[PDB]
């Protein structure tokens, strides 16, 4: 059962319901703390999230979570895919409005493997047979 279910209210894509599944890290605890409504605070260069991960040491990188976002139901698929397309087409990531952690959403095109920097964080991982996906990285501030 999903550690977070809520709404994504992102850019010009109509708000839609989504849920989260852990894929990297050894705990979903930061996910369980996420708020009910998550909005776009702004766009980020794709390098931002990877630079942040590179800048962190092992002690801190053990506290990062990576989630796969999923449409909550069938009626949410269309807008989920539209949000994917918005980020992919603009070659950007999204800084979310979440306050307890820094949450970055990023697109991952179909059949593409988990980004390499995320591979040593362990966790269930991601099967290669995924369609265009929204992932999110959760960074604690301490």
Q: Would you kindly state where each structural domain of the chain is located, as residue ranges? A: 4-140
Give the SS3 label for residue 125.
coil
Q: Give the phi and the psi of residue 64 in degrees, each rounded to 5.
A: -75, 145
Resolution for this model in angstroms, one decimal place? 1.7
Query: Which residues, at least 6 apart from 12, have a Cβ–Cβ distance to it below 8 Å?
Result: 86
Q: What is the CATH number of domain 4-140?
A: 2.40.290.10
Q: State the method.
A: X-ray
SS3 80: helix
Tokens found for residue 87: 């980020």
Contacts of 21 (CB under 8 A, 6+ apart): 2, 3, 67, 68, 70, 124
97: buried, middle or exposed (CB in 10 Å: 19+, 13-18, 0-12)? middle
Token duo for residue 70: 């999923």
**Which residues does residue 106 pair with via DSSP β-bridges, in sequence order?**
135
């Amino acid at each position: 059962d999903s550690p977070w279910e809520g709404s994504l209210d992102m850019f010009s894509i109509k708000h839609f319901r989504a849920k989260a599944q852990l894929i990297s890290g050894h705990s979903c605890q930061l996910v369980q703390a996420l708020p009910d409504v998550i909005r776009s605070a702004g766009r980020l260069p794709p390098s931002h999230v990877w630079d942040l991960l590179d800048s962190m040491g092992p002690s801190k990188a053990k506290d990062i979570c990576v989630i796969r976002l999923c449409p909550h139901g069938s009626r949410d698929i269309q807008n989920y895919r539209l949000l994917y397309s918005y980020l992919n087409n603009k070659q950007c990531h999204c800084l979310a409005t979440v306050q307890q952690v820094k949450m970055v959403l990023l697109p991952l095109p179909a059949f593409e493997p988990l980004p390499a920097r995320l591979r040593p964080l362990g966790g269930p991982g991601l099967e290669i047979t995924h369609t265009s996906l929204l992932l999110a990285v959760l960074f604690p501030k301490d």
